[model samples]
Target: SKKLNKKVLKTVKKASKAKNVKRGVKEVVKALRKGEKGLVVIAGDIWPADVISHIPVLCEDHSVPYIFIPSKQDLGAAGATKRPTSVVFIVPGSNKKKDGKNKEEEYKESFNEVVKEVQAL
Candidate 1:
């Protein structure tokens, strides 16, 4: 049960270190519409369902794979921030605009591994 959750969060940790994650609902929505694809992790609390209700469908429209973790707090920490994140896009490989720093291949393989686990659900 906990296997997948940890792996996903671990993915978040690696990406946050690489600065390849997009946190919060607004950014994720914007990026999703802009053709950004990554494993989307949604907070599963009985939160204001109305605000984030439409995101599940939006992810489908963008063909982005997604999943749920039980705590927004946990999600935030893994995103390497200190706020409760409604959702986070674990974008693999750096999308840096400039010829900037390189990233570890850490997340790429783990990303795919979790996605496969997601579909198997």
Candidate 2:
């Protein structure tokens, strides 16, 4: 749970810039409903009203992998060079979308390793 969530967060930042990430609750849900699946990460610390709580069930209903991070503070800073928002990673970096649009370059296998493990679960 802990280790993979860290890896997921990296892809959150990576794809947030690579250009397929949905960073808000509204946008994330729309992606799922529309069948554009990826990592579904939500900040576990937010419990004032349980606003985005139903996301996990939604993800599972559609075969999307979900990871729950323990907090949103650092995560807010992690996305987009400190862009705020507790959770994201929908459409996280992967082998696809490499049709010469990457603004950055690095092996995407980092996320794939965890993707295989999470998808196995």
Candidate 3:
């Protein structure tokens, strides 16, 4: 896992190296769909009308792993932002396995649950 963390850090650094990066739910979704995302980091306070409006559904469909931090500002800082980034996808370790297992399984399980719950609504 530490190795994966290092890989993730390296990938983040690599993304940082690329200029004019956009950090919005739509942009994050684009990255995921284009196979340019490994993990997605989200702000806990992101409103239903904002990120949760559609990104969760898209991330689930795309089988992307996402984690929530305490605040958008903290999320922005973690995402290497000069300002707040409510939603950002990290292209680290995409399709990289952990000991021959797909890491998305864990997230997939949770995503399936969410899908079921949403369908019931």
Candidate 4:
């Protein structure tokens, strides 16, 4: 179980380091609901009683590729902030103001892959 935890931690780190980690779930859900494709990574410790308690489950229910990291501190570090970040969604390109075409293509490809993975279940 520790190994699984480690693996999950690794993915979480990768997700966190990603430039796209959304600041919060509402930003994430708003983006996704608007046809955006991205990964939602939440801190594992945020389970049960955290404000974002339902996020991980909801992301899973929606077939989003959600991940659980080890600590909110690590997430905050990855987010380049001092405040604890319980939830972060990784969008394709958050640093640029794109023309929208490339982002649309990325959304289709990534979302389709998520669908395929869910269907394989």
Candidate 5:
């Protein structure tokens, strides 16, 4: 198990609002399969763990760093969602072509910091 500071959660909220997040297990899995690089954050309290049991393996196979937080409800709150989510992928930057590169880099810095933290785990 890994511990996270509030900074990581805050980053998730910011990224979600910026649309740099892939919410839910299905989206995360799909994105990873497509070779998207990001941090995988899973809620530790989800059901029997069976539901998300394969996530770590898949992440490892895809070379993505993953971590488990304390609760899905808290994860949801940090993700700016009303309902709980089992997992979320915090992608660093926006894919919009018209977006400013500088702003995209700024948007990615915080997420990159969290990614470094998760990778260090």
Candidate 6:
């Protein structure tokens, strides 16, 4: 199994605050089904496999890039959530800014780089 880099977790944390992210399996699955192109990060240790097993398949069907990390706890923390999450989708942002600062611009470089890495997998 490929062990995702710490930098990937860092990017997730930043994206959680800076960009739009879909947290949890349901949200991630919905985004994939809707054909939203982005990186899908899954927790490597999720039990039963069946819980998140279909995610990668769906991602492939939609041409979305995906990768697995070490654990759900860390993923949840990186996702800015109090509870552990099995999946997360980091959606690319549009040019328009909701708040004063453009959060997307701050994370675009690292995020895209990570996306490239996942795609390369």
Number of the predicted model whose TM-score against the real structure is largest: 1
In the range 1-27, model 6's lDDT, one tens digit per residue, is 333456666666777765477776677
lDDT of 3 by residue, 1-121 (tens): 3233334333344445443134677777777777665556555676544766555686567866555443565445546678776776655334443212444444334433443343344
Better of 5 and 6 by lDDT: 5
**Candidate 1 lDDT, 11-119, residue by residue in tens:** 6776676677887677777777765456677777736674366565765577666776676777777776766767677666434432234444556666667767775
lDDT of each: 0.66, 0.58, 0.52, 0.55, 0.65, 0.64
Off by over 4 Å in 2: 49-52, 81-87, 92-109, 115-121
Point out where model 3 deviates above 4 Å. Answer: 1-22, 47-49, 93-121
Candidate 4, residue 12: the lDDT equals 41
lDDT of each residue in 1-121, candidate 5, tens digit only: 2335466666666656677677676777776776554777776777557546667577566767666666687577767788787777766553453245744465456556666776676
Q: Write out the backbone clash pairs for model 1.
A: none
For each candidate in turn, the TM-score is 0.76, 0.63, 0.51, 0.54, 0.71, 0.71
TM-score quality measure for candidate 4: 0.54
Worst 10 residues of 2 by lDDT: 98-107
Name the weakest run of 10 consecutive residues (lDDT summed) in model 4: 94-103
Runs in model 4 lying further than 4 Å from the true structure: 1-18, 47-53, 94-121
Per-residue CA lDDT of candidate 4, range 1-115, in tens? 2343344344445544545456675876676676453666566675445535556455565646655445677667667777876666656553243234644445435533553
> With candidate 3 superimposed using the best TM-score fit, by how many Å does residue 35's alpha carbon deviate from the native?
1.0
Candidate 3 accuracy as TM-score = 0.51
Ranking the candidates on lDDT from highest down gives: 1, 5, 6, 2, 4, 3
